[PDB]
Amino acid sequence: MENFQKVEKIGEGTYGVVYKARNKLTGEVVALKKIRPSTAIREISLLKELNHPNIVKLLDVIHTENKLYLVFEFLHQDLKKFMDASALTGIPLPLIKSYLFQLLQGLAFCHSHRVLHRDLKPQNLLINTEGAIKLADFGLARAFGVPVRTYTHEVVTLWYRAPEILLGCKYYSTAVDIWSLGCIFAEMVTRRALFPGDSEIDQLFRIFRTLGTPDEVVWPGVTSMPDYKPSFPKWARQDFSKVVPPLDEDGRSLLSQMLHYDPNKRISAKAALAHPFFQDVTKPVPHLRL
Ligand SMILES: CCCC(=O)Nc1n[nH]c2cc(Cl)c(-c3ccccc3)cc12
Q1: Under 8 Å between Cβ of 228 and 167
Q2: 138 Cβ partners below 8 Å, 6+ apart?
Q3: Which of 79, 148, 187, 272 has the least CB density, counted as fewest CB within 10 Å?
Q4: Which residue, judged by its Cα, is nearest atom 20 of ligand 1?
Q5: Is position 121 annotated in a ligand binding site?
């Protein structure tokens, strides 16, 4: 775009190239996303009004010479990079708590306007020096469905996918985002991915090896689902003290409610914020190197 001066290529998205740019009129540093129907245009235009402190601001939507440009607020780092830098020491519990609290606040706002992300991962989670965390790419999965591969042919991660999506459920609810956040929560505490599957079936069998193979008792309607097979191996449920040590009981209780099989019984973002785990939340600042 003409009104912007590119500074450098800052990454590869699901849909297109992400650049760090500067506006020639305002002088403001921005994140410029470039992609490549009329309904997809309407969907993204509505997101310019989904404003909250824990959601990455969609500053503008530009459709020119038959290509999509998305102007976002700039944040210096993502959670994936922070987790790798903090891998040998771990992220301190007060910081893990604050990030989850703030993420749950972002989700609660969006789910109240009937908007879901559908593809949460540490990569699309952005952090700053003031101790804040924000959700990036929110609502883009409704506009264009999640592909198998990115524009660069890179494999789209299955690690954070909810079990209802993997079983062939056509009508996804907001409970899908609560699952992904729960998986990210466990990863922050553990310093290792919860379910790092490398195929849809590997992902599904990894969930089952830990949480137990679901049945009509725990999940009413699971056996009637599109991709469910009665030939599925029957694994028993693992404890939880083995799943996320050395995390306390309040943390184990909250994670358990976020990882429930039945989407209807899985805790909402609003209810999670009322959990006694957040009794002593604070807002600490991390030691960011930029
Ligand atoms: C992680 C440090 C560089 C970076 O991505 N900065 C961002 N600033 N604002 C952004 C807004 C967005 Cl939307 C995405 C971004 C994140 C995931 C996938 C595609 C794009 C990234 C940034």
Answers
A1: yes
A2: 47, 50, 55, 56, 110, 115, 117
A3: 148
A4: 13
A5: yes
Is 122 part of any known ligand binding site?
Answer: yes
Q: Please give the positions annotated as active site.
A: 119
Element (H, E) at 200: helix 200-211
**Has 201 been labeled as part of a binding site?**
no
Name the experiment that determined this structure.
Answer: X-ray
Q: HSE, CB side, 13 Å, CA atoms: give it for residue 165.
A: 20
Helix (H, G, I), strand (E, B) or coil at 147: coil
The number of the ligand 1 atom at minimal distance from the alpha carbon of 13 is: 19
Distance of CA 120 to CAs 26, 75, 263, Å? Answer: 32, 17, 17
| Ligand 1 within 6 A of CB of 11 | yes
CA angle 8, 130, 48 (to 5 degrees): 60
Gap between the Cα atoms of 51 and 213, Å rounded: 39
For tokens 């469905």, what's the residue?
A: 145
Cα separation of 132 and 128, whole Å?
A: 6
- Resolution of this entry, Å: 2.4
Domains of the chain plus CATH, in order, are 1-76 (3.30.200.20), 77-288 (1.10.510.10)
Ligand 1 neighbourhood includes 72 CB (under 6 angstroms): yes
